[PDB]
Design a protein around this ligand. Sequence first.
Ligand SMILES: C=Cc1ccccc1
Ligand SMILES: C=Cc1ccccc1
Ligand SMILES: C=Cc1ccccc1
Ligand code: FES
Ligand code: FES
Ligand code: FES
Ligand SMILES: [Fe+3]
Ligand SMILES: [Fe+3]
Ligand SMILES: [Fe+3]
Lengths: 446, 446, 446, 192, 192, 192
Amino acid sequence: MNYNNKILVSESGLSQKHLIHGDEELFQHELKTIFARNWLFLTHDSLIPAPGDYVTAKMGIDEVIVSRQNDGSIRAFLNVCRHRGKTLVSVEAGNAKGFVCSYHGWGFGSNGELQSVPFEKDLYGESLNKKCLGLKEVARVESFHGFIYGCFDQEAPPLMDYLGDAAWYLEPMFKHSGGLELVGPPGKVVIKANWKAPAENFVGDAYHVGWTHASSLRSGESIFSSLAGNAALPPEGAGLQMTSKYGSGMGVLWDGYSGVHSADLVPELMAFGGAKQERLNKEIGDVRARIYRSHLNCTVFPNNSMLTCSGVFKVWNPIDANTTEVWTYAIVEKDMPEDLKRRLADSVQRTFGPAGFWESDDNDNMETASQNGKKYQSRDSDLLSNLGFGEDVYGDAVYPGVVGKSAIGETSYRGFYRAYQAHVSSSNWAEFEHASSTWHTELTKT
Amino acid sequence: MNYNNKILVSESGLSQKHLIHGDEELFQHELKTIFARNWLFLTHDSLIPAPGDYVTAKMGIDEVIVSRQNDGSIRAFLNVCRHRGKTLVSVEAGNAKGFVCSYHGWGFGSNGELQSVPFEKDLYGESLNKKCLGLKEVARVESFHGFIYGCFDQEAPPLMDYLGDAAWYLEPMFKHSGGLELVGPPGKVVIKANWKAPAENFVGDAYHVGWTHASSLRSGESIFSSLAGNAALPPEGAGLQMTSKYGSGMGVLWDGYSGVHSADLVPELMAFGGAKQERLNKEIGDVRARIYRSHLNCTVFPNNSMLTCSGVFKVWNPIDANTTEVWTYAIVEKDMPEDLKRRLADSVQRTFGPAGFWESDDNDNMETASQNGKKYQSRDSDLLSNLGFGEDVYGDAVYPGVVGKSAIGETSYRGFYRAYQAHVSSSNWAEFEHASSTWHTELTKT
Amino acid sequence: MNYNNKILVSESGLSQKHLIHGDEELFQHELKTIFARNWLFLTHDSLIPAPGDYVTAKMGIDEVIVSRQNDGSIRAFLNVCRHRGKTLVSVEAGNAKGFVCSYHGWGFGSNGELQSVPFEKDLYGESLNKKCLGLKEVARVESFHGFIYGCFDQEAPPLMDYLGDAAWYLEPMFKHSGGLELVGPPGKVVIKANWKAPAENFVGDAYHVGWTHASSLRSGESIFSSLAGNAALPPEGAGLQMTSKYGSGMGVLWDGYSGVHSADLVPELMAFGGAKQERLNKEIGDVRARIYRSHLNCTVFPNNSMLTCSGVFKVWNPIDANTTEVWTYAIVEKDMPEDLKRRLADSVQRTFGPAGFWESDDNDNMETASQNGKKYQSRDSDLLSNLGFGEDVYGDAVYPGVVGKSAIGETSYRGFYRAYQAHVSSSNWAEFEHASSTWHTELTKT
Amino acid sequence: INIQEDKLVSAHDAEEILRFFNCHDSALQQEATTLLTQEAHLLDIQAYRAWLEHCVGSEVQYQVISRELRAASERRYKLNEAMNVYNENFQQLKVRVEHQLDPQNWGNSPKLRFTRFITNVQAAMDVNDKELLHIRSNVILHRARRGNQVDVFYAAREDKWKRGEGGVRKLVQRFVDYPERILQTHNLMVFL
Amino acid sequence: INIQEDKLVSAHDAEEILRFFNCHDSALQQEATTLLTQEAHLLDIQAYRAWLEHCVGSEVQYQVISRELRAASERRYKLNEAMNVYNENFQQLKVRVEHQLDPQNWGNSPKLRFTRFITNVQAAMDVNDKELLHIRSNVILHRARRGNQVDVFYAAREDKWKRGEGGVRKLVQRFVDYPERILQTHNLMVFL
Amino acid sequence: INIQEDKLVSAHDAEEILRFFNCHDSALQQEATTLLTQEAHLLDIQAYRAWLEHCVGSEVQYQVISRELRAASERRYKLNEAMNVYNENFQQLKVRVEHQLDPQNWGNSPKLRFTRFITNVQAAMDVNDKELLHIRSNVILHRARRGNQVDVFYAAREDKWKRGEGGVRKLVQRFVDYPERILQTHNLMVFL
Ligand SMILES: C=Cc1ccccc1
Ligand SMILES: C=Cc1ccccc1
Ligand SMILES: C=Cc1ccccc1
Ligand code: FES
Ligand code: FES
Ligand code: FES
Ligand SMILES: [Fe+3]
Ligand SMILES: [Fe+3]
Ligand SMILES: [Fe+3]
């Protein structure tokens, strides 16, 4: 397939070829043009707070070691020995000044440097240039209010610019709330879906909630519960959708601070969020303080998603075109009482973890939509994302980005897939930029 | 591999490259040139007799919904939602006026039309063109005496013409017997063989019976039992072989009405078939009445096979080059007593079902012959099908098609593979026809 | 990938692209340029000593039948029926005058000839040319002191020349000891590693022993035990490394006759080897008699390895780029007391068999180093084998081949990979020879 | 169990629960365990004749079904719900046993390896036929052949056993509703 | 067990061993076997309401954890070692049961098939609370759905059971440390 | 069993059947169940030293074989039929235990997870040695490590147990004929 020419996503992101969820050659191409090029979620400050603390993480299909340095910075390295290529670290988290390879005993520092080689003097003499044998380092590592992302491409925009218009929406919860912590360890489960299926669902799919999650809405008594079985459409002005230049987007459901949490947490959460909102009105204004305590379903392009307020934090780690390893963490506000943080974390896993009853509702939808992308008569078929097209705006006086001023639509699908197609057909960041110079105009046509 | 030029099947169908049972690129090519082009078995009238009745079926690797319409006709549709591509129907059979997608709740009619979209007015307004969003429909659906076949290619010959000379042999049992019913549900088992291995075996392999099925012949006491361990060759005139332009073919074993059924059914069956034959003599003549009660091992090209009289009905559903999902139904004559139909159905499954002891004899033969097609030193090797070559005729005064007037030979292999090669090297039906304008001459050379 | 041009192994074998352990297209290319071209281990005289005795063996991904002929010779044939390609023999060893196919009953002789076809006269008449339907025969089968190797390529050098300089080192144990026997049946286990990972480890990796096998060294009390946890470097002159034109190579650890065997065998073995050495001094000289009772870790290119004295004998049978089927036999000296042979065989399996505690130490090293070769950021990375480079010699007065006069280094890696690259980039033996006309000069640069 | 409340429970399954909740007889559960363990041992070593002679009643019905996948809400479609993978009388079991033992059953060389794991044994005497013993048990059946073929079967078995010749308790009915609709084990040619 | 000598053994595991090595009560092991077999039967037939009513105490904690992979030599890193796949009180179990029984739980059509295998049952009364019964058992849980989906779960269960309403012994705590870190079963939506 | 009639049955297997069909001792089957459950518990928590101390006799032979695939009709080829995956005396088991516990056994970090399922227990005293207890049982052994590695082993175990120090019954012989010829579990480094 010629990725320069092949129209995988139609103009304005209105449709996508179904093969994108099934084609293994395209998956391999995505390793280069999506995962090696873009910012990918690694960890949080709260999981590696002290010098020597490290975790392992996936970046695409690669594995990296992410380590807190003595100077307080974070560096990340391929989890691959520079000698004969053995996996260096076999655990998920710990604290160490370095990592020794179990094959021939080469010792690397937390800073990636090759520090020791067994019997170096007797064996290599002075001929081994250890300075050139440091672990292969992730070129870019940046923080968004404690959330640590990596990028293999030195040419990428800074993480803040990459978030584009989405940053404005995340800031009330990520920054102005006093800060978030990530509660680990994550749940980890393999699903038989393409990574794009859950990514697209979290970025912009409010439509599915009442029908897909009918049973969970009815059983859990959460605050979005009136939606169960499409019994009721959210009122006018119940929310909005947004998307951005580099593909990140989200839905906003006004005031939904208790999110998917079952009735046993609703009063406490609604009290806590409202109290902080009242303080925030004075700082960031009424609208942004309200956004803080509003439910955001967001994908940070390409494969990191979250539900703020619900506190669900996801990585959709790609394995092959029909296999994804799902990592699930909980996010909590740092200044919540510790007992509330614990119960919130358990509730995140209860609803969206490995045995998350909400997440289970989505399984068949994601898996079959993905697997159908391999089926002969469906490869060249068109997945539709036209809901709300022709009603989106850009440059609004209050809400930035490409915005659909309605709670349910496909605005964020279009921006996600516009960015996806621009990357897939480009060889580098410069070409993506050229392919994106009229991004918002394309999305707001008609 | 260049499929225009590559000789996968030699002149007159005398041999085939072993790679055809193992090559995944060729498997992918077959999805286009075999499965998307030809007639494939779906279901029987008896399994969807009333309006709203539906079943799911495979067509190649695709899944379809096959539904009885209010007007009595049958239509079939891809089991894929037109919105974001989720699998619409997750059951195997039922009765419904429509199908609702569990992802976003789109409702399709039994006629494939998009009938309802949740909150359409509020969300899409008048902008959603539902008329253009019907399920992707199987272009051609036709019946052969209740047996329903589908074809994705609008250009295919009518099913009756496609059956060619094979139809004459099937008619006494399929039509003149008063009609057949398919007894469901089918057994379903995955084997590690290429779909062509069982297809070729059923189309024309009488040679294997005495040796492969030695133990089943000896243990079951059926009427073909003298063959056990190649103890005895069938007499002269014990049967014949035939093949046809579009690839279908069969063996005829004279008088073998009780087929593979164990001795506990032999007297009853031999009485029943003989009684109906005596009536049929007056209607269709002695020869055709005898064919009615003769054992036919047939493949309807490409991947539907059967043993008449034994009542075994097979679909070899392709998964990949070394994986096939085997569906097994029983066929019974409509006017048989109900108790006999029940015992016949159980006996079909006893011998050739998921725990069919006869079918088990074939497992290693099909699986290893298929898997060897992937092995380096065997890919370019030649599978032989030359038995009886130079003794076949065409245009016989009594028996139509390319016919070998002997019970055991490879006549039907040659016609099957001649048609296979003509399809694989052709881009459409017109090219197949051009490639087949001297089909019988090619088969009867020498 | 263009294998004529792609530098997979750098000059002097100093490094290899990590993709070589993961790339499936290259694996397929190796079936042609490595496995179909080179000598592969089949069996030993001791496992098929009498006429009619046979075993099955893999050659690459192909399976062969290896049979002792009436005249005392050995012939080997593809385990594939010449009719419709069924696997002929389903057992691992036995005694027979021929093999009958379970599909249609064709009977082949132990000499590969098609001897009988059921009902040939009635079915084929005189038209079947059985003379042209013999099993596909392995072109070359030769013995190295009872060890039987096969090669599909008629153009290969004789096995003795193929062993090149490695033969001189093997001869004291393989020939001058009075001869070895292979004790079967082998252990068989699948590991998730590329075949090259264990092949390279056995050919030249002494460096890993102290660290990888720290626990086994400490627990078993064997004679190499001072190495445990890199507690101690072997003294000067503890051993050497060698490699050869056609890729075979080995390490020599002086005097290590009890090898990996736990203390319960050390005194008996050290007595036995020393006694035979004292006799051999008079026959083959002191140096070669000492080599006899020295531990050799050897790979016979491409995928047969061994530890002499330890008595471990390995075949790394390729399945795909990250899958290898490991066969483990024991080698014993024919003139050892029978009770010692039995205990030695058990000890080989105890240490390096399916539950070999030493072999288990290597699992993660081989599997992860192989699987990392598929990971995007590692494919184009360089595996290093530069230890000892610039200190190797050729044409030494005492020790032949390219030799590193030190116990620990990467000399044998370099020669293995030099030969590998020359084969991968060549279409035939003539091209390999041309690509190898300065093989030792390339290895001894600097 | 009220199946109007416990919406996922079939009438048949609710009836079978009731059987074992009532008169719990410890000694009977132990007799049943012995019976099933010995039966499984005979089968594992492929003593198929001994199995017939010692474990199987002359009036046996040995039945394994495969049920078509239907909608949980389905109420209209009423055609055959299941097919019989097995539905054997004694003579039909004997045919299958002879097929296993035939020296020209090529699939049985090299010899197969069977390992059965029997768990969750429950036993209760029938209310009306005080000589009819109901036994429920689950089986994991592992079949290995030809180097690298491995098939694992999982099932619940509803048995009736009754005293026969010599007073030996023998199988007079086995019913299995096989839980996997599409078999991924090459075939179901094992005695569950 | 001395965990200073038996280096691979955790303090928790050593404590649990001690419990069962002491007063071995044959009758108690049999009561426990019956309790667990009947519980598994109710679950297998998807009688989730009956399971709650008959098997689960009002004060239950139903907990399944997933432990982060850490170095055997790790001594410094002290953050949350595990997450809760389940950590349910009775009301939370009831929510999950209602979710299973809801007619708009699309994932449950066609009906799932469950088969559970309970083994290695051990039972001992608590030292200090003579009404608290400790039961340990292992489960293999087979879930089949939608033709060709098959998921098999494996776990050890540390239970506490106590007599409740009507004198019926009910589950008051289940603890499972799930042995596989990355699930390869699509989800863990089964009651272990 | 007549092995001339039951053609698929080996002489060895027929001999072992005979052992358990005869004097059935209910109490002995229960003692055996306890012994094997406790042994499996010690192994599952990786208390390998405790296993040696409490479960393994000084005179033990611990043997697991792999049998070469041969024709069912084979009568001429008479070379070594099997190899020993294990064939260990007490000292050799101790070596393997020390290897497991060594802090430089890199493969054991992060810590492995074992779950064993023991079923089909049969027990009978030896005829001639009234202190020798024959125990047969089947094991499913689940080993999970490193996130996504899962290996499942299946086997029948022929044991002899005898009273040792302190009157404690200990394993003096275990024999397993492993049913899969080519292992698909990376290795057989588990104590069956
Ligand atoms: C995409 C998941 C979701 C879940 C709850 C509310 C909005 C969106
Ligand atoms: C191809 C299977 C077959 C079975 C019985 C008779 C003829 C053919
Ligand atoms: C490569 C394995 C090995 C094992 C022992 C000594 C030298 C080498
Ligand atoms: S592979 Fe890491 S030290 Fe050699
Ligand atoms: S995918 Fe079917 S309604 Fe959206
Ligand atoms: S395939 Fe061997 S005789 Fe036909
Ligand atoms: Fe959802
Ligand atoms: Fe057949
Ligand atoms: Fe090693």
